């Protein structure tokens, strides 16, 4: 049990405070460093585990020992001494560049920083499969863990007298969060008259009871067993976008269709939600073209009318009708059109802001309703 | 011809449906796989072509054979058996990490996956130049296609018994899109009194008749022959941004000048369009200094008043008057100022939304129009 | 929660729903990067290059060593009551 003294320090953040005290539990004592220094001198192999009765095993890795044993030592009786030094000097200077890029000025805070095992690959000899084998890191979810960069290390001791770095590497454990479901959404376009429109919704959505929130898939791998994320991926969703996903459909934003857009039909419940005003829906059973009047924005294709349908040169057998016949413009409320471009947002936001300032005097007049 | 039976499938997208059926045409029958397996067993070189009359040639590439024939096999009369295995083991484990990073869990949908020839470079042995020549891929536009990642491969067959992956690689054919013009825009700053401003316009703009659209140069190479693009780069432009490009200068958003902005003079029609209120425009042929009065926002320099002009430290020889004398502030309409920062947009959008809610009881109760 | 009926009327459809799992760190193991190799079998053939290698390492290693010490000296045992 230790306290943070709190007086020799300046403005410090929760990450640096927690990591600073966590360094006390993970850092080896002065005796272990002396024992580690003595055992590292006698080490000859690129990867070697040092067994100590006091605590757990420590794995020692050397990033240029493989070149020396496999290439240089067998050539000692063949090459000259001048050439041997030249070849090793090339490998040492390339090694230093990777150490400089890893533990360098780009690493602003060496204490609060977590380095993934894959980012350590060159510092470890080039590969990490032999390192993970000797660390005991294996299982049915190693690939999913490794794909999310879940194996991370922290610097615990740097020895400038013997030139070695000690890190604390941990194999994560997977815990399921109750009440949270991660939904992946897909969409198709629809036509209002002759314009093809598209609904803007998040690609991933997470729900927890009555709460709908966004989801970040940067650190998440969607393995068949389940979704595994390194960092907690839930961040809040705007209340207006939450009413869209609850069925209002007037709070959802529509965007126009770009040049590269191959999402015009989706197979769902043995049916075909297809935009027949933007592609050609042909009924292979009868040869009749499935049309779509301007009063309809979407059509659902089932075997009750067209058992086999051809869309965009693709023939698909459909089944029982699980959907209505079509969606009508007069019986659906659609949202306002938007543009997702960075410059398009700025142009429209600036135009809207200017309009508000031109009527500032009218807006502040709250007594106009009272007067009338 | 085949039909997709939409019965054993869940929700499937058009890309998954189209790629699934396209796999039937691309995949080889069980006899060709049996013949391919026998030929691969007798292959000895890093790259070989398999000849058969049932189809076209199949190129066989193995990613480690170059090391074995060039490095390992020659050095076996002097190296021990144990050292030979260690040297090969290092290469086999780095090759695996390339295949894991390529065909592993990071590849969520192998059916609809198109892999560029560049991404396969290490899996092909390190270099793709010798692979491209044996595929017959050459011509004057190889560099433009190759730089746009136009050569892509699809996964066709995976054999776990003999450990090989069959891919379908295609050389694209370029077709010019009728009626589409891609414009590259440049701009200079202008001064309103003492403040230097700048017009926010897209760097690339597409034109098709009366319609103006945006352009995405991410996959596009502007080769001397022409513009070659992998995907379709046209996406819709906001109607307000289209009125700006069509003449309405009040619809163009303007932003303040950064600290690294050094675009203050442009050479156009043999003249110099310069912001002389922000740089020192000096007439070399006379020694006088060209000034920009605050009633003018931009200056056009021609040889009719100053044949040679020094701009910052560079002297250029301008030509006959191809532009007006200057642009006057009272004879031009400018748009609203904006900020393109993500935090600047959020702060200004929240302020605008909050003011809108403060007048909801008045904006919705728009009945004084008919009451007055 | 999500009203899937109205989402399908505007083209939006669900294509997958699973449970959410995060990562937690419980145990820790020690990994040591031995920066200085063993050159006993080389017989002084790399004397000059090793010294060059050591000098470059100190320039980048020394700031990290100072940062670690400055924080671990600010950690003191509990002296309650």
């Amino acid at each position, epitope marked *: 049990g230790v306290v943070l003294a709190g007086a020799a320090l300046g403005v410090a953040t929760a990450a640096q405070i927690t990591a600073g005290i966590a360094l006390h539990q993970s850092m080896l004592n002065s005796q272990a460093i002396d024992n580690l220094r003595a055992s590292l001198e006698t080490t000859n192999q690129a990867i070697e585990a040092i067994r100590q009765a006091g605590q757990g095993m420590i794995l020692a890795v050397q990033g240029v020992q493989d070149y020396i044993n496999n290439e240089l030592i067998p050539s000692m009786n063949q090459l000259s001494c001048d050439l041997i030094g030249q070849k090793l000097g090339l490998k040492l200077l390339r090694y230093y560049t990777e150490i400089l890029s890893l533990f360098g000025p780009s690493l602003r805070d060496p204490i609060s920083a977590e380095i993934s095992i894959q980012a350590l690959s060159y510092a470890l000899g080039g590969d990490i499969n032999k390192v993970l084998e000797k660390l005991g890191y294996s299982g049915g979810d190693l690939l999913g863990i490794l794909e999310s960069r879940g194996i991370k290390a922290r610097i615990t001791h740097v020895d400038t007298e013997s030139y070695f770095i000690v890190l604390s590497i941990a194999y994560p454990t997977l815990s399921e969060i109750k009440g949270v479901i991660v939904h992946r959404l897909e969409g198709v376009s629809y036509n209002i008259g002759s314009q093809e429109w598209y609904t803007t919704v998040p690609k991933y959505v997470a729900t927890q009871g009555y709460l709908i929130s966004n989801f970040d898939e940067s650190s998440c791998t969607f393995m068949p067993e389940g979704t595994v994320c390194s960092q907690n991926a839930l961040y809040p969703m705007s209340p207006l976008l939450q009413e869209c996903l609850r069925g209002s459909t007037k709070s959802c934003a529509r965007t126009l269709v770009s040049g590269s857009f191959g999402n015009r039909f989706i197979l769902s419940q043995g049916n075909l939600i297809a935009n027949c005003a933007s592609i050609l829906c042909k009924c292979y059973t009868t040869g009749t073209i499935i049309n779509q009047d301007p009063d309809k924005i979407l059509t659902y294709i089932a075997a009750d009318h067209c058992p086999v349908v051809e869309v965009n040169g693709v023939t698909i057998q459909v089944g*029982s009708r699980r959907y209505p016949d079509a969606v009508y413009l007069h019986r659906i409320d659609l949202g306002p059109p938007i543009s997702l471009g960075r410059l398009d947002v700025g142009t429209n936001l600036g135009n809207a802001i200017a309009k508000l300032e031109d009527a500032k005097e009218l807006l502040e007049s709250s007594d106009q309703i009272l007067r009338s | 011809g085949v039909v997709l039976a939409g019965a*054993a499938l869940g929700v499937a997208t058009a890309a998954q449906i189209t790629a699934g059926i396209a796999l039937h045409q691309s995949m080889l029958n069980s006899q060709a796989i049996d013949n391919l397996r026998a030929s691969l067993e007798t292959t000895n070189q890093a790259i070989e072509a398999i000849r058969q009359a049932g189809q076209g040639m199949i190129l066989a590439v193995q990613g480690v054979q170059d090391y074995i024939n060039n490095e390992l096999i020659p050095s076996m009369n002097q190296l021990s058996c144990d050292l030979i295995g260690q040297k090969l083991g290092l290469k086999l484990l780095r090759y695996y990490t390339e295949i894991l990073s390529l065909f592993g869990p990071s590849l969520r949908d192998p059916i609809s996956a198109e892999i560029s020839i560049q991404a396969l470079s290490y899996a092909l042995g390190g270099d793709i130049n010798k692979v491209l020549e044996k595929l017959g891929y050459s011509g004057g536009d190889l560099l433009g296609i190759l730089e746009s990642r136009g050569i892509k491969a699809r996964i066709t067959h995976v054999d776990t018994e003999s450990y090989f992956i069959v891919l379908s690689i295609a050389y694209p054919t370029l077709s010019e899109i009728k009626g589409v013009i891609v414009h590259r825009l440049e701009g200079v700053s202008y001064n309103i009194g003492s403040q230097e401003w700048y017009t926010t316009v897209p760097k690339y703009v597409a034109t098709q008749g009366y319609l103006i659209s945006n352009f995405d140069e991410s996959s596009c190479t502007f080769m001397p022959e022409g513009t070659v693009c992998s995907q379709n780069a046209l996406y819709p432009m906001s109607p307000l941004l289209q009125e700006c490009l069509r003449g309405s200068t009040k619809s163009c958003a303007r932003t303040l000048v950064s600290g690294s902005f050094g675009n203050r003079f442009i050479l156009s029609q043999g003249n110099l369009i310069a912001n002389c209120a922000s740089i020192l425009c000096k007439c070399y042929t006379t020694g006088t200094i060209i000034n920009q009065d605050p009633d003018k926002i931009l200056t056009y320099i021609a040889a009719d008043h100053c044949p040679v002009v020094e701009v910052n430290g560079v002297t250029i020889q301008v030509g006959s008057r191809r532009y007006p004398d200057a642009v006057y502030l009272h004879r031009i309409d400018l748009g609203p100022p904006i900020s393109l920062g993500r935090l600047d947009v959020g702060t200004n959008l929240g302020n605008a939304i909050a003011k809108l809610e403060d007048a909801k009881e008045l904006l919705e109760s728009s009945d004084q129009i008919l009451r007055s | 929660q999500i009203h899937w009926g109205n989402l399908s009327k505007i083209g939006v459809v669900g294509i997958g729903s699973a449970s959410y799992k995060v990562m937690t760190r419980s145990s820790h193991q020690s990994l040591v990067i031995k920066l200085m190799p063993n050159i006993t079998l080389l017989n002084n053939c790399t004397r000059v290059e090793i010294a060059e290698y050591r000098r470059l390492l100190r320039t980048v290693l020394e700031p990290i060593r100072d940062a670690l010490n400055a924080m671990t000296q600010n950690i003191r045992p509990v002296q309650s009551v």
Partner: antibody
Amino acid sequence: DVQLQESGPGLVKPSQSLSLTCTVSGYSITSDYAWNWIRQFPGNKLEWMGYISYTLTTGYNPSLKSRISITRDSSKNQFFLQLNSVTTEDTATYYCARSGWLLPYWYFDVWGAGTTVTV
Amino acid sequence: DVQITQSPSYLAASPGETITINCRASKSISKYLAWYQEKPGKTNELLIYSGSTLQSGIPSRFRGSGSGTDFTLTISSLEPEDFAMYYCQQHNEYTLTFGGGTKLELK
């Protein structure tokens, strides 16, 4: 083709918990459709219990929703039925079926073999 | 909920004859009603859905009709395999209520 097969205890003590398991073959239950539970009383009476959708949406019979719960297992491709406070009236033949997930098209197109529960 | 009554409870007929089963709902359910066939030793089969739509693979002799509250199922040219239990189930709303049932006996 889609094959549904129930497997559970034939006899359960009163006021205990009932646990069934409908295993689905020839499809995946994490891909589309509503997976339902229907029970047939002695006397030719069918009664809908509830459903789990592939979007993990659940619904139950209003007169039985208090003591019922439906859950799914993606790894083994099966879904379960949990019934508590079992009385003598709960004895029936229990059926697992597949519907679509959207009204008014909630008709069942694949049924399980069927299993009987005695109280 | 909606109450559905299926009549007759038992029906005796002979092969080659035409029969008719009527189902009545307390409240209008549009055209949304499904018909099923129950046979011992085999799983149930959907015959008609959404009023009068014949499921693929079902013999054409099965006829559905009606809209709102009155619904009828017609089987013509009876075969020995058509003698089984039949149900009518409405799929419009919750709660999903089946029918009483109807059995066919040879005569």
